[PDB]
Structure formats: structure tokens, C-alpha cells
Ligand binder design. Structure first.
Ligand SMILES: [Co+2]
Ligand SMILES: [Co+2]
Lengths: 131, 138
């Protein structure tokens, strides 16, 4: 098998500051500072849960991919999960061979990623990232 | 970063996904993605059947309604194709946690016995950024 550990769960939030402060000051999580990533059109806050991370996303730019998501879910909502694969290239070829959204691109962690359409995943947008 | 950290929040225990078909969802993660998938476990006391997808560092729970009064039944009526439902974070002691939330004037959605036999509570997604968060005793 090529599948690995869950890298992160992504949450689109309508306010980055108040979302990060909730997990930090209400739930007592270890929370990072807001990191702007213009090449991906989001600002990210990393919530470290020990075994995995939570990514709080906020749009950065008008053509941001998650800008439309927050327009349908104005209060926020779960966006996608990220599972690691030992090799992104053999994975896509095994998925293409298995006749299974994204046309391989460098992800928000500097590693190549792809996104699977939620229809084939049970309703959840699944991002596969090179381990 | 080896900083001073005093907190009762723990590891992420699972991420829950409500699916319109348990069998076809479990088969996808097992046979398409190569994940370790459990057999369907019925939980009538909670009105769901659950399939556990073990990713090593955490688990994903694929939920399907079991009974007409299922709690995720309304979710699957709005999201017919499925969707992410909630996350579950462990706490070192559920009782000290709930009152620390009450002291912080945080109104909770739910203490009840959860799907793993341990006491749980649910926070309203408005205060969590849109995600339903379940706290369960570690
Ligand atoms: Co991501
Ligand atoms: Co749960």
C-alpha cells in the first residue's frame, strides 16, 4: 500500500484571528501564527494536536479557492483532509489506472499534492501529499 | 519547540464522515486508496453504523444512519453525497474540561456516553469555526 498517515484536517473559517484564538485560549491547543501563502490564495494557522495538525484557512485574494466555500458556509466548515503517500507519482498512475479534480502541483508544504473529487471519496475533498 | 505547555487538550482521536453508502465508502478507502479498513460495526444505541479507517496516527469514522431517528440523518438529507461531519479531540479529564468551558462562558451543544463507551460533549460549530467538535475523555 502507498497510503500513509493523515497529515492534517483543513477548516475554512470566517475569521482567522478569532478561530485561532478559540483553539488557543478556550481549548488550550498549541496554535501557530497566521502564515500568508499568496501562491495558494489562503492564510493558514496551524493547530498542533500532537498526532496530527488542524489547518485553519482564510481566503487571501479575491480569486481564492475557499472564498466561494465561505460564501456557502458563512460560519465556516470542514474543507478537506490530507493523507500522505509514499510516492505521489506512482499513486496518480495507480489512480489513473483504476479509472479514478486537480489536473500534480506543489502544495502548501512545498511537496507535490493532488486533490480527489469528493464524489468518489464519500463527500469529502481528499488531498494526497507526498510523504 | 520545547516550550512550557500546560493544557488538557490531547490527540485527535478521529474525523467523522457521514456517507450515503457505508459499503461503497469503506471499499473505496480499502481497495482504491489501500487504507486499513475495519468491518461495519452497528451501534444501535447511537443510531449509526461505523466503519473505522485506520491511518496510523488517527482514525476516520465513516458513519451511516441506523434507525429513523439517527442524528446524522438530517445531515445526509442536506448533503446527499456525504460530507465531513465532525472531529473528535481527546481531553485528559472530561469533568474538569466541561466546567473550564462553563467558566469561560462557552455554551455547549450537548455530558453523555459517546460511541466509544466514554463520556463526551459537543461544542457548537459557531464557536469552533464551522466544525462540530466532540471532546471525549482520553
Ligand atoms: Co491542505
Ligand atoms: Co465521534
Amino acid at each position: 500500500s502507498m497510503l500513509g498517515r493523515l497529515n492534517h484536517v483543513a477548516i475554512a473559517v470566517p475569521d482567522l484571528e478569532k478561530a485561532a484564538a478559540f483553539y488557543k485560549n478556550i481549548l488550550g491547543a498549541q496554535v501557530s501564527e497566521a502564515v500568508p501563502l499568496p501562491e495558494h490564495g489562503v492564510s493558514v494557522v496551524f493547530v498542533n494536536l500532537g498526532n496530527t495538525k488542524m489547518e485553519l484557512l482564510h481566503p487571501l485574494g479575491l480569486d481564492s479557492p475557499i472564498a466561494g466555500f465561505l460564501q456557502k458556509n458563512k460560519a465556516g466548515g470542514m474543507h478537506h483532509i490530507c493523507i500522505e503517500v509514499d510516492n505521489i507519482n506512482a499513486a496518480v498512475m495507480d489512480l489513473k489506472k483504476k479509472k479514478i479534480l486537480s489536473e500534480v502541483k506543489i502544495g502548501a508544504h512545498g511537496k507535490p499534492v493532488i486533490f480527489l473529487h469528493p464524489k468518489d471519496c464519500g463527500g469529502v475533498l481528499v488531498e494526497l501529499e507526498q510523504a
